Each structure stands twice: as structure tokens, then as C-alpha cells.
Amino acid sequence: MDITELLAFSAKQGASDLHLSAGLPPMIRVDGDVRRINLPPLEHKQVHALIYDIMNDKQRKDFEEFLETDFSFEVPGVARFRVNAFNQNRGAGAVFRTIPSKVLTMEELGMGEVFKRVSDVPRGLVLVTGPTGSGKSTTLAAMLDYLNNTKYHHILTIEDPIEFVHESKKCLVNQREVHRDTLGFSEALRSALREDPDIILVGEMRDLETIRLALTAAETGHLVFGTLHTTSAAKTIDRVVDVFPAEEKAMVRSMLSESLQSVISQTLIKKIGGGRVAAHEIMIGTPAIRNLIREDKVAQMYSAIQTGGSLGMQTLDMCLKGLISRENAREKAKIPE
Amino acid sequence: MDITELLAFSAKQGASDLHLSAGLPPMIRVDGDVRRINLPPLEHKQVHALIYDIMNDKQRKDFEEFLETDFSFEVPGVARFRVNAFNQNRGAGAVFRTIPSKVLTMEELGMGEVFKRVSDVPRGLVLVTGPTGSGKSTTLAAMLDYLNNTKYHHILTIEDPIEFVHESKKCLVNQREVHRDTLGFSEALRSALREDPDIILVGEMRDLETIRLALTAAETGHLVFGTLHTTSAAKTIDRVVDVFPAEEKAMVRSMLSESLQSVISQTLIKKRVAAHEIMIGTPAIRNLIREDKVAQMYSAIQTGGSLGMQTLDMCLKGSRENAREKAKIPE
Amino acid sequence: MDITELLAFSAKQGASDLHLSAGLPPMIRVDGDVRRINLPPLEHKQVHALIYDIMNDKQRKDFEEFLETDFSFEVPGVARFRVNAFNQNRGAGAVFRTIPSKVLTMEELGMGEVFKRVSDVPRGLVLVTGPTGSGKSTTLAAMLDYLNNTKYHHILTIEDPIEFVHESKKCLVNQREVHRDTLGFSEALRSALREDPDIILVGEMRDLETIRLALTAAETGHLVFGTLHTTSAAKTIDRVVDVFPAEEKAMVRSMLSESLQSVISQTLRVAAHEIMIGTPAIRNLIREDKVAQMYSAIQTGGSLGMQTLDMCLKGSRENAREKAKIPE
Amino acid sequence: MDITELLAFSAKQGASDLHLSAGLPPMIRVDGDVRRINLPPLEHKQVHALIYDIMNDKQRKDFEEFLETDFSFEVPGVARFRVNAFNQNRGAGAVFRTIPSKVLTMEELGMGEVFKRVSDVPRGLVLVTGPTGSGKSTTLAAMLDYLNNTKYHHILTIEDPIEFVHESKKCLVNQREVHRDTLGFSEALRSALREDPDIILVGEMRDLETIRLALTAAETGHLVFGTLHTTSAAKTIDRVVDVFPAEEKAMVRSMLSESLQSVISQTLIKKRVAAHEIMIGTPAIRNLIREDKVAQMYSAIQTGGSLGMQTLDMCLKGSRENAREKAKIPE
Amino acid sequence: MDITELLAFSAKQGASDLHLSAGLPPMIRVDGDVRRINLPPLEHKQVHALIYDIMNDKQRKDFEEFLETDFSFEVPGVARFRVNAFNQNRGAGAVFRTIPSKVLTMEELGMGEVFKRVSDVPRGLVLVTGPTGSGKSTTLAAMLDYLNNTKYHHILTIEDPIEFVHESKKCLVNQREVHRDTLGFSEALRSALREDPDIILVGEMRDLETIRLALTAAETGHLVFGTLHTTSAAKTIDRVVDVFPAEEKAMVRSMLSESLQSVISQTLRVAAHEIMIGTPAIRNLIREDKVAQMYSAIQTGGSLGMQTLDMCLKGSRENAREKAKIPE
Amino acid sequence: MDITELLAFSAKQGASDLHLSAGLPPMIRVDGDVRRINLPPLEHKQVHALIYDIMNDKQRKDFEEFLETDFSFEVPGVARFRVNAFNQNRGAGAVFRTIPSKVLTMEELGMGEVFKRVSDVPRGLVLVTGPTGSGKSTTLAAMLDYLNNTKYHHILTIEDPIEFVHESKKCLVNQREVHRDTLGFSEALRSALREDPDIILVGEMRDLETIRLALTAAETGHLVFGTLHTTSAAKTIDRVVDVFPAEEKAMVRSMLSESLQSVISQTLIKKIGGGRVAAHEIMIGTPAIRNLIREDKVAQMYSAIQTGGSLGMQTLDMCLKGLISRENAREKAKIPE
Ligand SMILES: Nc1ncnc2c1ncn2[C@@H]1O[C@H](COP(=O)(O)OP(=O)(O)CP(=O)(O)O)[C@@H](O)[C@H]1O
Ligand SMILES: [Mg+2]
Ligand SMILES: [Mg+2]
Ligand SMILES: [Mg+2]
Ligand SMILES: [Mg+2]
Ligand SMILES: [Mg+2]
Numbered sequence A, F: 001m002d003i004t005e006l007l008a009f010s011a012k013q014g015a016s017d018l019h020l021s022a023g024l025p026p027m028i029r030v031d032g033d034v035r036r037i038n039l040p041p042l043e044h045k046q047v048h049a050l051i052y053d054i055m056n057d058k059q060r061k062d063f064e065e066f067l068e069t070d071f072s073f074e075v076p077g078v079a080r081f082r083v084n085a086f087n088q089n090r091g092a093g094a095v096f097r098t099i100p101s102k103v104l105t106m107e108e109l110g111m112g113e114v115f116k117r118v119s120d121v122p123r124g125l126v127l128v129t130g131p132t133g134s135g136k137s138t139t140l141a142a143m144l145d146y147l148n149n150t151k152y153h154h155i156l157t158i159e160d161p162i163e164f165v166h167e168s169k170k171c172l173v174n175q176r177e178v179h180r181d182t183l184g185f186s187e188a189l190r191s192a193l194r195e196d197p198d199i200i201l202v203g204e205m206r207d208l209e210t211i212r213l214a215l216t217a218a219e220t221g222h223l224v225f226g227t228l229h230t231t232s233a234a235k236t237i238d239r240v241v242d243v244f245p246a247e248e249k250a251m252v253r254s255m256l257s258e259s260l261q262s263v264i265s266q267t268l269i270k271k272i273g274g275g276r277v278a279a280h281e282i283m284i285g286t287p288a289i290r291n292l293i294r295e296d297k298v299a300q301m302y303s304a305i306q307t308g309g310s311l312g313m314q315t316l317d318m319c320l321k322g323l324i325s326r327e328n329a330r331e332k333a334k335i336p337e
Numbered sequence B, D: 001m002d003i004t005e006l007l008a009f010s011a012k013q014g015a016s017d018l019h020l021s022a023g024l025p026p027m028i029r030v031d032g033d034v035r036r037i038n039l040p041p042l043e044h045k046q047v048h049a050l051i052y053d054i055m056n057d058k059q060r061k062d063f064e065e066f067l068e069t070d071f072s073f074e075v076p077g078v079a080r081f082r083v084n085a086f087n088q089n090r091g092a093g094a095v096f097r098t099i100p101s102k103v104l105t106m107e108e109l110g111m112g113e114v115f116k117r118v119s120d121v122p123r124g125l126v127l128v129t130g131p132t133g134s135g136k137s138t139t140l141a142a143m144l145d146y147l148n149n150t151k152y153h154h155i156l157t158i159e160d161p162i163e164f165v166h167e168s169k170k171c172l173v174n175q176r177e178v179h180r181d182t183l184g185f186s187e188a189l190r191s192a193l194r195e196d197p198d199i200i201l202v203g204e205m206r207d208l209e210t211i212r213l214a215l216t217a218a219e220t221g222h223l224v225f226g227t228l229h230t231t232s233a234a235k236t237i238d239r240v241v242d243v244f245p246a247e248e249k250a251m252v253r254s255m256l257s258e259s260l261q262s263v264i265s266q267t268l269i270k271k272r273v274a275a276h277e278i279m280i281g282t283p284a285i286r287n288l289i290r291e292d293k294v295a296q297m298y299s300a301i302q303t304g305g306s307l308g309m310q311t312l313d314m315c316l317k318g319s320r321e322n323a324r325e326k327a328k329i330p331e
Numbered sequence C, E: 001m002d003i004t005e006l007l008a009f010s011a012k013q014g015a016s017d018l019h020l021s022a023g024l025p026p027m028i029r030v031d032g033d034v035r036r037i038n039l040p041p042l043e044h045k046q047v048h049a050l051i052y053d054i055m056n057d058k059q060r061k062d063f064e065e066f067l068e069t070d071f072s073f074e075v076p077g078v079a080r081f082r083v084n085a086f087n088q089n090r091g092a093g094a095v096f097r098t099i100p101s102k103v104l105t106m107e108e109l110g111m112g113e114v115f116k117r118v119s120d121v122p123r124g125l126v127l128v129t130g131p132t133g134s135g136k137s138t139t140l141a142a143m144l145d146y147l148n149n150t151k152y153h154h155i156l157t158i159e160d161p162i163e164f165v166h167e168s169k170k171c172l173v174n175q176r177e178v179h180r181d182t183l184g185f186s187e188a189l190r191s192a193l194r195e196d197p198d199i200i201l202v203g204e205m206r207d208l209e210t211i212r213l214a215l216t217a218a219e220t221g222h223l224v225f226g227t228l229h230t231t232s233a234a235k236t237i238d239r240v241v242d243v244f245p246a247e248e249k250a251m252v253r254s255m256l257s258e259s260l261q262s263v264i265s266q267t268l269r270v271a272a273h274e275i276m277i278g279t280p281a282i283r284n285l286i287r288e289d290k291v292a293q294m295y296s297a298i299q300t301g302g303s304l305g306m307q308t309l310d311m312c313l314k315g316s317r318e319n320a321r322e323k324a325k326i327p328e
């Protein structure tokens, strides 16, 4: 039972993550929960070998001298994984997080026309948000696949590391892995503006300069897709402005008001009778809402979403009233009722 | 079929852009849509060679060590291209953006005397703005051509890369390509002050230091031309100030109030044709800027017709739906 | 009578601390009081040897060149100790603070459902606070044990040194000893985000960077547990913001308003706790910088299980008043 | 006549200080006045040798490379001295300041129960203040002796240099000489938090970092003792806050409001005898500190007699002219 | 036709500037207008040689590696030039700006007693300001000549490069060329305080440090003359403060309030001047940060010889209005 | 006519400064005015030799590589000078500023009992102020001489470079030259507090840390003497507070209110019928004035000086009404009348 077999098994079980940890049997995360594989405990020596054998010399050196490190690893014909290796009280440990391989279509995900409308906009900013493991990336991949299926455009991506690999259908697709194909988000973004892109994917909007450049890229007239870890349209908007220092808030607020096209905040819910399903809050950037943003009256937006049904807007709670246990629903509702 | 041939072909097809991307055949953008040329897929090795061949040694080094780079490239008798080279999951790639060569005249563009009046000012700051493809450089080129036709002055430009190439008529024209003729906007702007210029073009008022130097250059007594991607005179004025940290905002606001002469915010519309919002820097407006009451400026434009001011929406009242797509106030 | 024997003795006597100090016999702290063990005085040479013998070569070098140092030390089968070694007028000295090994359960500590509710939250920041000794680590250990007993999650900890050692029950538990299993809090925290953790214990809100990363980790969706030495929910909240320079305060304030789930400030014996729970109103208080009002907001939050330190104290009267915000 | 002999002689003469200065004979300060000992002038070479002989190699290096240094020195059976060595126009010089050895008791100093109550607090910050020669260390020594006599606690001190040497009675006493037993106040204070102390002495709340750490140490739950040269409870409280830059003032103010237990500001008067202003940290006063209304505190002291508070002027009402020389309000 | 001949010709034509630009014949600026000399176009190779030949090896290196550079150049018996060398689309280029050599007197410039009164002050700061070209150096040179004619003082100057060369009449005059006679403004200014100067010309208020030292020099008791490119007394005062970071603004404001004696803002031909004189009221305006009021304070300061730019302009009407603060 | 002769001549003429400057004859400053000595012009080569010959190798190197430098130079039996050497358009130049040798007594300077009273105070801060060349230092030297004549105290000085050299009479006098006997003002001041000093001279109060330490030294209970370039008691006080950043102003203001004993602001005036005489504004630190300082109402102080005659206070203008031409007087009066 080598690491290849273990990973293959994890994939067979539909696991998102495989954990090694000295003094424990291998464990896998499935639908959120980490559980032990029915195998013997792995002692430090074994865990250490399993890791050290895969590593290359640099990785070994990084790991050995810094005590921890990150890298990507591939099991030909099975999947790619992002690997983190580290030390803990019992010894070595690692986490192999599976990189999703096949891209799932909007139909496969049960995503309706509203997502297409949101994808279709000719320019601006679209944000897909939610905490870790909420599926944001998969939703994005579907939106990009849809565009790849329908427009003769250029999709350029900046990813750290690249997750989904798309194949060029109608769109030219160029994916750029940070640290390997480019030196950083900033460099790639400053380049993006010179790479004739209709559509630009920016993996995550935390470090300010990325955000500035992302906004510039949207204002300048591209279609920009970014992400955050926020749980509602409002919090998303607060988050984007709040992070900047006072002197810089007004322009960010204005840029955002002009460029923001939609916000999709998302969570996964244990599906009644097994598996999980996504629930989405959806906001669409209409003049009134743009004023709410521009005037700093976002507090009102939640109801504006409530009344935006005709465009396909919906609050998280609304969506939850449409598969899931009422209690599960209430666990995640803004207003438990 | 070398890169020269490919670009020639692209031009023959009226393409705006040529794309190379490892693992694909060459592709071209025509009337918006990217398409494949009927040729075999190009693999990394081939794309890489094609790019390597055009590059000079510095460009190769930049590209090789930084993993991406930008430069201008010329195909004698055909066109000049804005080039970016980069790497991606399948390997190497590059984008060739054609650069329009000839400078079109105010008349050819149907630009009236107001633009001449704006060009004519003896010193200060003039900003031409709008999204990409709004036609900012085009408007600027015409303004500079007009000056070239009429004044015995020195026009200095700093561009990344050089877009329109002017020929010295009455003006001495010196155009400086960033990364090739100079190390950066800042360096060229610091030198500008000692290069006896009357008129300076700065391609895009993006970096704080470029803006500081641009404002210095205008305050010091030259006529400075810059650009932004903003969509109205007000937003332009906010933005120039907004970008600076708190400690520095007041002086930028004051400098700007003193030096700003005009703002021309622009967009292209089908019939394409340009529409312009035009603001002219009168004492009242300068106070609006100085006192931080730019919110009032939009109406001040509305009432400045005598000087040739006009809001974007006003100009749009000279397809109705196309118009409304771009109007501040759809009506 | 070597240092191993001394420490064993200290444990046998239920001492929290063993002191060595040139010119004195060994001394131990028991229920608060430091007292001499009935042994001869130890002279500089002897104390120095006792310390020097335990130290490893780096520790010896640190100690010799910096004149003082800290390290952890273990007596197999007895306990682990937080050791500090230093110099004083009569010569060398050292202080061994024993480490509580056994995890105690919420029930063993008489901690009620409110702690479970606080533990249960799916993400955000929870702060357990109080002066030295006050029992923060213990309260945390119980909270983590409860999670370990109930959820199939990943608990990652970062500690300087590791205090309590948990055994993986339903949770996978990874404990990381600073300086040994990782180079620092920052490194481990930056790594944490990519070690698929549900729950993260940050042993020390050591520096601004640790706090930043802790907040990032909470905001990103994990459940983070941290500590401060503050004595009340309000002071805790102030302190988290106060420590940052002006330019950075607003964002920390905002991040905190969004992510903070609870604050538990504590003192010891039996533990008394102030408990605050992160409701919208309180989040506004934090966001708007009106935390001054929060103390009463705690007073009126009984339904959720909130309570002021003084309230809890109303469950010796004098001992109580020694530690009350409002002696009455 | 070596330096040992000289110091012995100084002690024999009841001198507080011995001065060496190249180009002069040794000199001693007695009852305030500096005088020459009946000996030949000492030239640079001689003074330098005399100093070199006492110094250890580090002290020599410090002195040689930094041109001046400080250290403690002991003459067995006579006294300990605070030493500073330095250079001046005529050459080398040094100052030997005698350090009083024995710790005097509260009773010997006529200090009443209030001082015990202040000493007794379980944690927080206590500040003893006044100009040089006011008797701050003396008061502190007595407070620590009292604790040494009564509690089974750990007293840790950090001193530059160690002034009074305590002997471990009920308390474990660890005294740390800066530059010799530790590298600095900050290092020793950072270690203190891990040296299981009940009570910590910090000789002079002068540097920001020392203050920050002192406040941390008090807030974290220890009883911290510090000193300043301020002359009243209010001024002391202002000063502790004043010294910090704006961004940091609020937290220092808050920390202090929570942790401050007492302030004892002191001066010596002929009859010498000590006079004390005494403040005790009650909720009302803590608010005064917290809200930044310390201006009111002086009267709050006036009305705090029941707890043993007293203004400097009040205490002075227990020569009338000598008294008035030192009164806040001469009357 | 070498560069010496070209420059000689430019001087013969009374040109302010000579331009070289690959692909063009030499061009000269005369009374504002740049025009071609009747000569063949100069190609890159030729322009490059012309420049390369004058340059020294460092200059060549600077130019070659940085792509552009600045230096001074002298044509014995003709003039000195401020040379800038650079690159452009057609190839090399360069700009030689002639240096006004001859000092002109206050009388020759029609400058009245007010300038003498301003020159005469025993210490403090005097600022002569205005856009490029406006005639600041000239106005200064006249002020210094007047002092040179009347006081037995020490005039020290620091310049990049030296423009006007004074001859020692009653004053000892020491002129220091930056990069050649001194390493920088800062160094020279720090030195100035110990070169026993009565009067100091700071050629460029180059950076914050220069300003600091200039202010120190004025405050310390010397008479300091400096320049800025601002267009009015108010803007000058604002600018001197604005340039500093927040923490430092107050002290600069205060120093300036105390030391500032006069501001002379100027434009060109004939010169027009705005003149402000440092009276207590104005000093308060500066100190209290109410400079906004100063413009009228100038209007009412005629008795001392103050005058707004617009006032002076009321001594072609259109030309006048081109440069008026208030066109009327 | 070598440099020694030149300097001797300058001293014979009572000059404060001798200037060399390529292309000019030697010039000397006497009573304020620089005038040419009746000698031939000195060309670059000669000036350069005159300077280079005196310099030591380090000084030559400093000078040669930094293009300018400073040092002290001594002409045995004549005087010491502070020398600055530099380059200018005509070539080399230098300034030899004579360091005053004999110390002048209060009587020799016509200073009355008020100065003694001010000197006599047991502790606190005394400031002697005035622009360059106003004689401040000489006044101080007289005050120190007086103390040296009368008290058995320790006078410690920190000077950059040491000007007047005092001889130990009743006081022990230790003078410390900055850069030579100590590394800096701060170091020496931190040492001073440990060197048993009754009286401490701090040469100049500009760089903040020196001021902080100076104030500490005064508050702690020594008698501190410092200087500034200000022209009146008020401006002196404003100057000391104004220089600090906002957060630090209050404590400086308070420290100063408690410690300040007197301020003596001074100027020299061309004496009618030849030479010059000093005029002084004198303020003495009484409780009322201390409140003015403490409460930040220094604006009132000028009149408080006017009414402080009994203690020997006087405004600059008052003193001017007591040797000098009325016009000369008005040149320097706060209120010309
Ligand atoms: N009371 C007085 N009457 C006449 N001349 C005096 C004088 N006091 C000083 N001088 C002369 O004035 C010159 C400067 O004196 P001093 O050096 O004491 O002033 P100062 O304290 O301003 C030095 P600095 O200019 O460096 O601040 C010297 O030539 C000195 O002899
Ligand atoms: Mg993802
Ligand atoms: Mg353009
Ligand atoms: Mg603990
Ligand atoms: Mg003491
Ligand atoms: Mg000039």
C-alpha cells in the first residue's frame, strides 16, 4: 500500500484531502469529515519515507531546513495534488489536497440561466465567494467552461497553483501558474492588460495590490473574475472596501460601484439523503445598487436583493427555502425561522 | 511561415491582434473574435523559437529571467506591434497588438475648434480619458498634430511603447520609448524638465510618482498631456486625488486646481464615432476642485456651453439605444 | 540529589515551580507560596553544574553568551517543564515551571453547555484570556477535548512549547512545537492555511504578524482559538486593536468585528469566567468603536450564556472581591 | 596609595563620592563640597592605570572603544561603588559613588502602615518618585524588606547597578545587575515573565520599552515597582503617558488606569526627614486616569485621607521655611 | 561645423537653447520659438559623435548605461551651457541651455528700493519663485550684486551648476559647484554653518533635507536665499510645508513663520513680481495655518512695498491677462 | 608670510575669523565685517599648499575624497582655531575661526549681580541665546568662571569642539570634546548623570535627544546650561516646545515649566565711538511665569518681564534704553521708537 495506492484509494472514495500523520493510519476527508482509512497506524519512519521519496532534492532541502514546505505532485492517470509537508509532536505529517480534474458543467451542477447571464456580461467585475471548501472554484470553472463553450474570446488566468485545467474550445485559454509561469499576481496582471484578454481570472482578492490591479483591469474594460471568503453580498462589498487604508477607500468604493457586475456568495449543505448541494446568494449590479455602493449605503442592499427576483437575484435565505433538511438549512440561514 | 509572414498574414486579414500559444496554431482577432489560422498547431519549442528569433539579447534576458516581458517590434512597410511574451500551462506564448501608424487630423476626426482652444493653452494639464478603445491616443495624436502644424515648439513624448509616430513639422518632436530610449516614466519626466519642452505627453497617469512629476511639470510651466480610464470629468478629478495617501492629498488637490486646464472624457459609439465630455478649467471650477466640492462640477459643465464645455450626455444628443447604453442618465 | 530527583520531588509535592538560586537551597512553589526544600544551600558552582548538565550545546551557548535563556525539559515518566536560566547577584539561577500534562474534561472542570456552544461554531475567532496562571490553557484544552470527542475534524495547534498533549479521538490532532516542529508562529500559521485544518490553536498572540495571520485564518473560514493576558472582554477587544499602528487599526477593527465569535476572560482553586458572545449588536459596537458600551451588553446577554466577571463571581466573599471589577 | 586605599580613605572621611581627573589630585565630595586630598596631582598615565587596574577585560574594552563606561565595584568589608569612567580635555577620569549597603526598615524610617498596605497589594504598579536624593530607592528597599519579612514570594530585581542587597528571608530574592547579570532592562523584563516572580523592581521608568514591559508585567498579574523623577502624583501620571507617541498613548493610558495601585512622590527635608505625597488607586481615580481628567486628581488625593492618601503639602504640615521651600502652595 | 561652432552660432543668434535631434538639422530657440538652422539634417551617427566628442568618460558611461544624462559644458570666450543628453525614436538627442553669464544690476533690471530693503535684512529666509524661465536666478544675482556692492560680508553660494559668476567687491564671494566643488546640497549646507557666511544662496530647494538645512541655516542667524517653482507667495508657503510628511509639518510651519522674511514670486521681456514681506500678522497667518488670508494681507501691505502679482501687472493688456491671477 | 604669521596677524587685529580663498588676498573678519588684508592675491596653488601643509593624512584624505572637511588647529603660544576647508569656483578656500583663549570675567564684561544670581541657583535650566556671533558663549564662560571662582562644585561640559578651557579653581572642571573625548552629546549626557555633576554645559539645544536628555538632567536636579539661536525670552520658549512632535509637546512644556530658571537673549551692538557692547533680555523663572509656560500662555510673558525689574528682569528694548547710537539701538529693538 504505497502513496500512489493511497491516493488512488482516496480518489476512489471521493476524498478532497488525504492526511498522513505519524502515529495514525492514513485519514481522508469526505464531505467535510476526516476519517481513518482501515489501515495500520503509520509510524514516523514510514510517514517520513512516504513523503521523502516523492520529494525532489530542492523540496527535501526546503523541507529539511525550513521544517515545512509546499509543492504539487502528480499521479499519472489519477490526479494532481497540492502537498504540504510538516512536523508535529509525533513526527512527520502531510496533506495531499486533490486538485479537481474534470471540469463540471453548469448543467452537471444544476446551475441555471442566471449564471449564464452573469457570465455573459461584456466587462466588469464578478465575485464568487464563500469560506474554504464551499465550492467557489468549481462554480467559477463552470462559468468559464460555459464561456469557453460559447464565445470566441481569450480567457487568461492567474492561479497559485492552477486548479482546473481547461481545454481551448471556442476561447483561447491561457492559464498561468504563479511561481512557475510568472513571478507573481501583480506581474501577471500588469502583463494581462497587454495580453489582449477578454476575461481574466484572479485567484483571490486579499493582498491589496492584486485588488488594485484587479479593479484597474475591470475598470479598463475587461471581464474580471475574482474570489473572497465572505458569506453574503454585503459582507463581500464591505470586505473589498474595508481592507484599504482611509486615504484609498473612496476610489476603491467608486471603482467598485462602476465595475461590479455580480456577487455570488455560496455554501454547501449536507443534502438530505446523502452528499451535498450548493446554495447561493446572488446579487446583480444594477444602477440602484451601484448607487448604494457609491454612496456607501450598502446596508440597504440586502432588501434590494430581495426585490431583484426578476433579474435572478436572491438572498441566501431565499435560496434555502428551495433537497436539504430544514435544520441543516437553519444552521446556515442568515435568519433562522 | 515565419513570424514576419504570420504578421503579414494577420494584416492581410485585417486582424487587430495575433496570438501565439504553445499547443495551438496561430490565432488572430478580427472584428472582436479570436480565430485559428489554417495551420498546424505550434508546440512550445516552435513558439519559443519564433519569439526568441525576434527578441534582442536584453529582451531574451528579461524574458528568460523574469518569465515575461514587453517590447515593440516593427515589420518594415507593414506595421509596428506592441508585443508581450509570457509563459503558461502549455508553455510559451505571445501577443502581437498592431499599432496604428498614421496620425489622423482633427478634421478627419470631425473635431472642432474647442479642441484647438484646449490644445492652444500655454501651460498646464490636459487629460484625455475613457475606457480602452475609447480613442484617447487618437484624440491626443490629433491635438499634437495640430500643434505640430501651428507652433514652433518642442513636443516631447514618453510612451510605453511609442504608439503614433509624428513627423517634425513646425514643432521639434522627440518621442521616447520607455525601456528602450529611457529607463522609466520617472527618469524621462525628471529629464524632461531639462530638455526645454513646451509640450509633454505622458501615456497614462497611473503611478503616483508619474502623477507627481506630471503635476510638477505642469505647475513648472509646460503644457502636459495625460490619460486615464475614468468616464467623466468629475471622476477623473476625484481619481487623481483619491490615489494619493492622506498626507499628500491636499497638495495634489491644490496643484491640480491651479494647473488643470481641461478634461476630455471619451467613448466610441456605432453610427464608430467618438463622443466627448469636455470641461474647461475656469476660476469657478478651479475653486470647486480647490475646495473639494467637485460634486457640483457636473452642472458647472452643463452651464459652460459658451466656452465649449459639454457633458457626455449632452454630446450624445447630437442609434438612440446605442446612445442610452452609454449615457450617464438614460432617457 | 540531582536535578531529575529534585524535579521528581517537586512533582511529588505538587509544586508548580522549582527555583534554583545560587546561595540558597532549592525552593518550590506550592499553592502560591515559595518555600525552601530541607536541603543544604546550593552554591554557584553546583547550581551552574545542575543547569549546565541538562542543557544541550546550543542552550549552553545561548546561556553563556546571552547570560540567560529559555528551553523545555522532560523527565521521562514524570513531567515536562518550562525552564528559564539566568544570572543574579549571588550567581546562576533557574526556574522550572511544570507543564500540566493530563487534559481535563469540561465536566471535570464544571464547564457548562455555553462552552460547548462556543466551541461548536463553524468558523471565526475565539479568545480565552486572563493573567499568568489564570487557567487559560486548561480551559482551551477542555474545549479542544470536547471537539475531539464530538467532531470528525482536523485540530492543528502551534505552541511554544506544547503544553497539553491530546490524543486523536474523532478529530485528527496535529500539535506543532515552535522552534522544534516549526520555525515560528508566522511560518506555521502561513502553513496552516494549506494543511486543511478545521480548528487552529495559536498558543500565543505573540506579535502583530501572528495576529494578522490568526485573523486571516479565522476570516478565511477556519475556527481559530487564541489567547491574551487581558482581564475582561472589553480590554481584550481594545487590546487587539490598540497594538497596531494607526494606519492599520481600522482594518483590524473591521476584520475583528466580522470574525470574533466569543471572548472568555478568566481567573482562578476554582475558575471564574467572563463570557461574551459575538452577536450583531456587539459586532457593531466593535465595528463602530463603541466597545465602551459592551460591558452592559454582556450584562443583558444572559439568554445566550453571556456573563460579566462580577456576575459569575456571585455564584470566599473576600476572595471574590479581591478579583471583582466592582467590589461590593 | 592605590585605588583601594583611596576609596578606604574616602570612606574614612565620610565622602559620598571620589573623583579622579587627569591633571588633578584625587578629590572627594563631603557634605556637598568637592575637596582635594592632600596628595600630589595625578597625571593622565597614572589615572588611566588606576582605572585600568580595577577594570575587567570587557570593561577595559567598553572603555577603550566607547571612550567611557559604567560598572559596579566592591571593596570587601568597606562598600560597593557605582563607577563611571570617561575622558576629558586633560585625559582620563572616573567617579566613584558610594552605594549604601544596609537596608533600613520601615520602622527605622518612621514609615507607617499605609506603606505596608501599598506593599501588600497582590498585583499592579507602584511608583516611587522624586528628584535625585529624595530617597526613592531607600523607601523601596524598606517596602521590599517588609515583603521579604512577611510573604513567601519571589522578589526579582533588575538594577543598573544593584544598589541595596537584600538577603532572602521569607521571599526568594534574585537581584539582576544590568550589563553584568543581564544585557538590558528589556531582556530581563521579557525573561521576568517566565521567572515566576511575584514582585518585580525596575530601577527607573525611563525608556519606552522598559515602561511597556513594566506595564505588561503589571497587567499580566505581578506587583511591579518603578521610579521616576516627577514631583507629584498627577505629574507622574501625565509623564508616563506623555512620553509615548500619539498612536500609543491611549493604550498606555488604559493599561495604567487598570494597573496603577499607588504613587508615592517624595522629597528630603532638614529637621533630614522624608515627606511623601501618597495616592491610592481607587475606581474614581482610575476613571480620572482612564478618561484623561487627571487634573482633578490633586483634590481627590486631598479627600482620600481615610485610605491614607495625602498631598505633599498636607504631609508637610506634620522648619516652616524649609517646608515652604518644597510646598506646592507656599503659605 | 562642429558643436563648438554650432554653440557659437546659437550665441551669435541670441538663442536660449540649442537642440540636437537625430533626423533633424540643428535647431535653436530664440524669443520662445524653436527653429531649424539652415543646415543639413543630422543623422544618429553624427549627433551621437557630436555629443560623444564633448563628453568625458564618466559622462559617456552615465549616458551609455543610463541612456540619458546631464552635465555642464563650456565654450571658452563664448558661454557655459546646461547640457542634457538623451535618446528618442530616431536616435540620440541633446539640449544645450545657455547660461546667463553677465550679472545685471538692480538698476539695469528696473528693480526698486523694496528689493534692497528685502536684501538688507540681517538674517532669515528669502524666497524668489516662479515657473521655469521666469527670471529667478537673475533677480537673485541682482540682489547679491547689490549686497556685494554695499556690505563687507561673506556670500557663499551652492549651485547645480553655478549660473552667474560674481566678482568679490565688498563681499567675499565663494561659489560652490555641486558635484565638482562639493558632493551635494546637504554636505555644502552642513559645511556652510562652519564657513562663517553672512549670506547663503541655495540654488535648488532640491529635497526635504536641503530645506531642513536651509531653514536651520536661516534660523541659526544667516541670511538665506532660496528658490521654488511656485507662482505666488501663498502657494510658496503652502508648498514648503506640504512637501513634508505629517509628523514633521508643524515644526516646519513654525520654523518658517519665525524665519521667513520675504517671498518674491515672478514671471516674464520685462519681469513682474508678487512681493510679500514677513510682518507679525503674516507670521501669525503662517503659524496658525491661515495662509488663505495672506493674499489680501499682501493687497494691504503697500506701505512696506508689498504687491500682488495682479497689482504689479497693472503697471500688452492681453499679455498681462494671460498671466493674471484674476483676468479682468 | 606663512599661515602661522597670517593667524598671528589676525589675532593681533582682534579678528574672529581668517578666510583664505583662491584668487583673493587673505581676509579677516573684525567686529562683523570681512576685509582684505593688505597682501597679494593668493592663487589656488598657494591656498592649497597653505591648507594641505597643515592637514594630517586623515584630514587630507577626508578633504580630498569628500571635497570638504573640518578640524581644529593650534598655533602654539597664539591660539587654537576651528578650520573648515573647501572648494569653490576659483579653487580652494578655508576659514580659520579663532577659539577664544582667555576667559573674560563678569567684571571685564560689565555683567552685574543679576548674572550671579542666575548662576547661583542650585538646580534647573538656564538658557543663553542669540544668533551667530552674538557672544552667547562668552557670557556663559563668564558665568562658569564665576562659579569656578565661588563654589566647590563639579562643572562638567560637553562641547563640540571645546571652546573656552577653564582651569580648576574651586570647582572641579571636566570638559569633554565631542568626537574625541566622547562619542556624542547623548552618550556624554547619559554619562553625566552618573558623573556627580553639580553643573552641566550642553553646547546647543537643536537635535531632540540632546534636549530630552538636557531636560531630564535639569529635572533630575542638576544645574544645566544650554543655548539656542533665538532673540527673545518668548521665542526661546516657543522654540524649545515647537521643535517636538505633537505627542511629545505636553511633557516638554511641563518639564520646562518646572525646570527653567532663566533665559538670557543677547545681541552685540556697534558701540558709539568704536567696538561693540552686549545688550540682554533677561527673564527669571518665577511661579507666575512658570504657569505662563505650563498653561501655554507665554504670549503674556513679555509684559511679565517688563514688570520683573525687582528681580533684575528686563526686555531687550528696556536694556537698549541704557554707549550706543539711538539708530543702532533701533536697528535691534523689538519696538522701534
Ligand atoms: N560682550 C561682548 N562684547 C564684545 N565682543 C564680544 C562679547 N562677547 C563676545 N564677543 C566677541 O564676539 C565674537 C563671538 O563671541 P562668542 O563665540 O562668545 O559668540 P557665540 O556664542 O555666538 C559663538 P557662535 O557664533 O558659534 O554661536 C568673538 O570675537 C568674541 O570675542
Ligand atoms: Mg478553489
Ligand atoms: Mg491609448
Ligand atoms: Mg498556559
Ligand atoms: Mg535611587
Ligand atoms: Mg535659473
Ligand SMILES: [Mg+2]
Residues within 6 Å of the ligand: F136, F137, F138, F163
Ligand atoms: Mg559660542
